[PDB]
Amino acid sequence: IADEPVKASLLLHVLVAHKLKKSLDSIPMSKTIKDLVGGKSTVQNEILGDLGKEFGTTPEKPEETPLEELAETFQDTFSGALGKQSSSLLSRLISSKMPGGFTITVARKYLQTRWGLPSGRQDGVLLVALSNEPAARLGSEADAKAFLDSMAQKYASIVGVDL
Amino acid sequence: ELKPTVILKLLKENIIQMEMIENRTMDGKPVSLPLLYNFNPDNGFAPISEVMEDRNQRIKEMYWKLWIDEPFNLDFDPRDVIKGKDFEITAKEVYDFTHAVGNNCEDFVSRPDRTMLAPMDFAIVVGWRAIIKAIFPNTVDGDLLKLVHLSNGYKMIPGAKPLQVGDVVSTTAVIESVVNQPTGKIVDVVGTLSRNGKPVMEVTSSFFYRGNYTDFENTFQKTVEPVYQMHIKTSKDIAVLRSKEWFQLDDEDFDLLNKTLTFETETEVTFKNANIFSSVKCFGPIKVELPTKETVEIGIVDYEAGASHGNPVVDFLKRNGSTLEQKVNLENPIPIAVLDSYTPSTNEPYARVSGDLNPIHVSRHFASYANLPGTITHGMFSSASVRALIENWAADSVSSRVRGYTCQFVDMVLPNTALKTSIQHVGMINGRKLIKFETRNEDDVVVLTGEAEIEQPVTTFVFTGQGSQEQGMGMDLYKTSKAAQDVWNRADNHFKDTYGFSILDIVINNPVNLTIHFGGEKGKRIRENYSAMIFETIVDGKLKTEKIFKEINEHSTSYTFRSEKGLLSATQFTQPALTLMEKAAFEDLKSKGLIPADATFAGHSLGEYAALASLADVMSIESLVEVVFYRGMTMQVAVPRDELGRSNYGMIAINPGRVAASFSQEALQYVVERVGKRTGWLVEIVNYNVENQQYVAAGDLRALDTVTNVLNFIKLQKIDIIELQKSLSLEEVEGHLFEIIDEASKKSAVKPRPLKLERGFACIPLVGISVPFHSTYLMNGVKPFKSFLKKNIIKENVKVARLAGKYIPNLTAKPFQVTKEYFQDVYDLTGSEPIKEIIDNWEKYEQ
Amino acid sequence: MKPEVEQELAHILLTELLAYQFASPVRWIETQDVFLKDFNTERVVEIGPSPTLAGMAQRTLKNKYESYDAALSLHREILCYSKDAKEIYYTPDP
Ligand SMILES: *P(=O)(O)OCC(C)(C)[C@@H](O)C(=O)NCCC(=O)NCCS
C-alpha cells in the first residue's frame, strides 16, 4: 500500500512505554521524563543514553522539557532510520518471544503479503508490537500470526491506515 | 641425509642382535638399543625367541642417554626426592618453544620496553629431565616402549608471578603414587618449579606402563582426600567422635556442641596385593569454623594401621558428613569458541626444544616396533597447542590469567591431523573461571579432554551507603540462596534475643511503629540490653555520657520506636538492613565461587562496614549488626529530634556543573564555606563523589535551604566568582555575597523546623538522611566510639593479607598499608594520640 | 615486622580508620581514581539495592577516562548486583 517513513514521535513514545513496561495510552505524550519516571535516579541517564544513541544528538536539558516537543526537535534531524538499539529490541523480541523459525524476514513477508504494508509502515507496526510485547514466547506459529493480526489495526488506530 | 637405522647380524652362533639406532640424540652421537633374540634351529616352527632377561634395563639405558645428562644408575629409591639441575631461561629458548607449538601471544614475543615472559607449558621443558627420571628406578620396572602419558597438569602457586626470561628456575620431582592396576602400572609424578627459593608452580604427570606387575611390595599411593565437613548438633555425635581413636583434639574438653568441623585429610597407603592395603596412614588437621567463617586447627587425625581392606576415616566421614567441593558448576555451560588446529608434518622441532627425544615421535622403525600406527605426534605438543587456544580465547590473549591447566591424552594423534577443540566455560573455583575443553580428530573421535583455570578480569567490589533502602530488599535472594538465609537468620536471631525485635520483619513489611515489651525473664534481659546502650561524647576534654533511651528505666515495661512512613527509613534499622543485605549478596557470590582471591574493595560511607565484613571477614554477623545498630542508634541521638523521629539537619547533592561550566568545585568549596560562617548554622562538604558533577553537603536544613537558593541565584544571573577574585575586585566579593545569603536567611528562618527542601536547579536534597554524617559536628563522638570498636573488632580476626593493598578506606582514599607512610598520612589529616604514639615508637615494632 | 605485631598495628589502623571515617569526609573521587586508574579494574561490581556507585563510576569514566580507556583499549564493565545479576553470575539467556 502507500509507504510512509517512521517519525520520531511513535519511536520516543514506544521506547519510554517499553522502558516503564506499561501500555502506550497509560503514559501521556504531554508530560515530561522526570514527572513520568518519578524520582528514581538511574533510569534518567538510561533514557538520555537511549535518546543519545538512536537520534545521535539530544537537546541541552532534555530531562525536564516535555516529550511532544522532544519528538518535534528529533523529527527536524530524523532521516527515517529506526535506530541501532530499536533494531536490537526487535532482534531480541523475534529471537526470544517468537517460535523456532518465526524470524524477522518472515514477520516482514507476512505484513508485506497478507496486509500489503511496505517497509515504512511495517517498521511502525513492529514498534507498537514492542510496547505490547507478550510476557513469554508464543509456542504456536498461528499465534505469532494472530498476534500480527492485532498490531495492524493498532498501528492504523494510532497513525491512520485503511486495511 | 641417509644414515643406518637398523643393523641385524649374529652376535654369537645363536644370538640374533637387532641393533635399532636413533640418529636424533642430545650430542649428535647416535644411540643404539641392542635387542637380542635366541635362534634355536630345533624348534623349526618358532626358531627365533626373544631374550626377555635384562630387556627392560637395555631399553632404559637407551632412554637414559636420550633424556638424562647424568651417569646411568637405576639403583635409587623411588620414595626419595629427585633433584633436577637449575635451568636458566633465555629469549631464544622461549622463541624456539613458541614457534614449535604455534603460541603467537605477544607476552612471549620480544617487544621494546617490556620483558619477555615464558609460557607455563615451558615448565615441562624445565622439569622433563627430573619428572621423567621418576619412571627409571629398578623398583618401578617396566618396558618404556609401551609407556603411555595419560595426563599432564600445571598449577601456578597462588601469588607467584609467571616465569620470565632471565629467571634461574630450580626443579624438584617426587613420585606421589605408583600402583599396579589390573592392566598395568600407573606412576603419578609431582614436579615443583622453584625460583629464588620460593616455589613457582606444580607439574603433575601420570605415566602408564602397560603389562602385568605383581611387585606390590614396591607400590604405594599418597592420595589427598576431599575436605569433609561435619555439623555437631547433638551430644551423641560428640560421643561417637570421642570413641574414634584417630580423632585426637589438642584440648580434651574442647566444646564441640553446635560447631562445624572440617577434616582436611591426606592418606598414605602401601599395598600387599590388589585389594588389601599393607599400611594405611590417613592423617591431617581438624579445623573448627569460627563465627567469622575463619577455620582454626583444634586437633589432628592420626589413624595408622597394618593389613586393612579400606580407610575407616574416609568411610566414617562420608556416611557422617558432607564433601566441600570448591568447583561450583554454572546453571548452563557457556560455549566460548570452537577452534581448528593442525598437528605439524614433523615432530623434530618440538623434540628439539622440549628435550623429549622419544624415538616413537621421529623414527618410523621404533614406532613400528612399539605397535603404534606411525610416528605419533607428541601428546605434550597437542597439550601446549590447545593451551595456546584456551589462552587466546578464554583469557583474551593474556598469559598471566591462566593459573591452572590439566589435560588427559585420551588417544594418539598422527602428524598432519586437523583437530577441532570445543571450549566451554562450565564452572567457577575461588573466583577463577573453570573452562573444560574437548579436542576431536577428522573421524570425530575424542583425543584430548582437559580443563583450564582462568582468572577473572581485574575486579573491584564497591558497597553502597545509606541511600535508598526500599522494603523487601534482598528478600527475593533470602528465599532462594542458602548463604543469604544463613546470614539473615543469624542476624534476626541475634536481634530477637538481644533487643527483642526481628530485622527480617522490619525489612519485609516496614511497620510505622514497633513496640518492644519487657515482660518476663527474657523481657528484663532485653530491657537491660537497651539501658546499657550509652552515647559517650567528649566536651572540653570531659566525658558527658548521656544514656540512649532515657525513658527506659528499671520500672519501664515497654518501649516504642516511632516513624512517619516506616521504620526501615529510621537510621538505627536502615543501617543494619542495608549492611545485612550487602553481606547476604556477597555470601551468595562467594558460595558460587565468583569472588577473586585478589579483588580490591571499597565501601561508600556505611558500605565500608559491609565491605570489611564481606571481603576481610574481620567481624562476625552478630558483631557486625551489633556495631552498625549501635552507631545507627547513636545517630538518632547525636542531633536534637522531635516526637516522630525527624531533625533540623540533612544533606543536599550539589551538582556544580549544572549551575555554570566555569563554576569549578573550588568556587563550590568557597561559597559553602561563606554561607556557614554567615548564618552561623552548619554547612560543610561531606562526600566528594563524581568530579564537577556530584558533591554532597550536610548540615542545618535551614542553612542547606539557603545554599540551594544562593546557587539558584548565580545560575539565573550567570555571575561568576573566580572571574571576580582573579580579573576584578580581589577578596571584596565575600561581603557582596553576604547580602544574597542574608536574602535566603530570612525565608529559611521563618520556615518551620521540619521544613521540606525543594529540588532546585543544581541541588537535589537526599531522602532517609536527617544527621550530618561525615561532618565535623559529630567529631566529638569519635574518641569514645574508637573505644567501642576496640571490644568488637578483636585483633585475632584481622588478617593483614586480606586487607593490605585491596581495602581502600574513605578516610584516606589509598590502598590500606601497614607501612609507616600510611600511618603518617592518617595522622596528618586526623590528629590521633594512639597513631602519633605508633609513629614515634615505630622502630620497636619493627623488632 | 613479625606477623603477630603486623596483626596488632593493622587492628589499630583499622579501628582508628573506622573511628574517624564516621566523622571525616568521604573522598570517593580519589577512591575511584585509585581502583579505576591505579589498578586498571575491568569489572566494577557494585553490591547494594540500587546502582548509585555504578552510576558514579559510569559518569567518572565518561568525564575523565574516555581517552585513557580508548588509548589502552580496555573495556570497563560496570555491573550493579541489583540489575546485572546475569553478567555477574555468568547466566546468559539461551
Ligand atoms: P542518580 O545517580 O541519577 O541521582 C543522583 C544522586 C545524587 C541522587 C545519586 O547519585 C545519589 O543517591 N548519591 C548519594 C550518595 C551519598 O553520598 N549518599 C549519602 C551518604 S552519607
Swiss-Prot record, chain B:
The keyword Lipid metabolism applies. Residues 320-445 form the MaoC-like domain. It comes from the Eukaryota. GO terms for biological process: long-chain fatty acid biosynthetic process. The active site is at 605 (for malonyltransferase activity). The keyword rRNA-binding does not apply. There is a cross-link at residue 161 (Glycyl lysine isopeptide (Lys-Gly) (interchain with G-Cter in ubiquitin)). Residues 1-423 are annotated as: Dehydratase. Keywords: Acetylation, Fatty acid biosynthesis, Fatty acid metabolism, Hydrolase, Isopeptide bond, Lipid biosynthesis, Lipid metabolism, Lyase, Multifunctional enzyme, NAD, NADP, Oxidoreductase, Phosphoprotein, Transferase, Ubl conjugation. One of its GO terms (molecular function) is [acyl-carrier-protein] S-acetyltransferase activity. GO terms for cellular component: cytoplasm; cytosol; fatty acid synthase complex; lipid droplet; mitochondrion. Residues 424-642 are annotated as: Malonyl/palmitoyl transferase. [Alpha(6)beta(6)] hexamers of two multifunctional subunits (alpha and beta). Fatty acid synthetase catalyzes the formation of long-chain fatty acids from acetyl-CoA, malonyl-CoA and NADPH. The beta subunit contains domains for: [acyl-carrier-protein] acetyltransferase and malonyltransferase, S-acyl fatty acid synthase thioesterase, enoyl-[acyl-carrier-protein] reductase, and 3-hydroxypalmitoyl-[acyl-carrier-protein] dehydratase. Present with 91800 molecules/cell in log phase SD medium. Belongs to the fungal fatty acid synthetase subunit beta family. This is Fatty acid synthase subunit beta. The gene is FAS1. The chain holds residues 1204 to 2050 of 2051 of the full protein.
UniProtKB/Swiss-Prot annotation, chain C:
The modification Phosphoserine is found at residue 50. There is a cross-link at residue 37 (Glycyl lysine isopeptide (Lys-Gly) (interchain with G-Cter in ubiquitin)). 4'-phosphopantetheine is transferred from CoA to a specific serine of the Acyl carrier domain by the C-terminal PPT domain. This modification is essential for activity because fatty acids are bound in thioester linkage to the sulfhydryl of the prosthetic group. It comes from the Eukaryota. Fatty acid synthetase catalyzes the formation of long-chain fatty acids from acetyl-CoA, malonyl-CoA and NADPH. The alpha subunit contains domains for: acyl carrier protein, 3-oxoacyl-[acyl-carrier-protein] reductase, and 3-oxoacyl-[acyl-carrier-protein] synthase. This subunit coordinates the binding of the six beta subunits to the enzyme complex. [Alpha(6)beta(6)] hexamers of two multifunctional subunits (alpha and beta). Present with 17000 molecules/cell in log phase SD medium. Belongs to the thiolase-like superfamily. Fungal fatty acid synthetase subunit alpha family. This is Fatty acid synthase subunit alpha. It comes from Saccharomyces cerevisiae (strain ATCC 204508 / S288c) (Baker's yeast). The gene is FAS2.
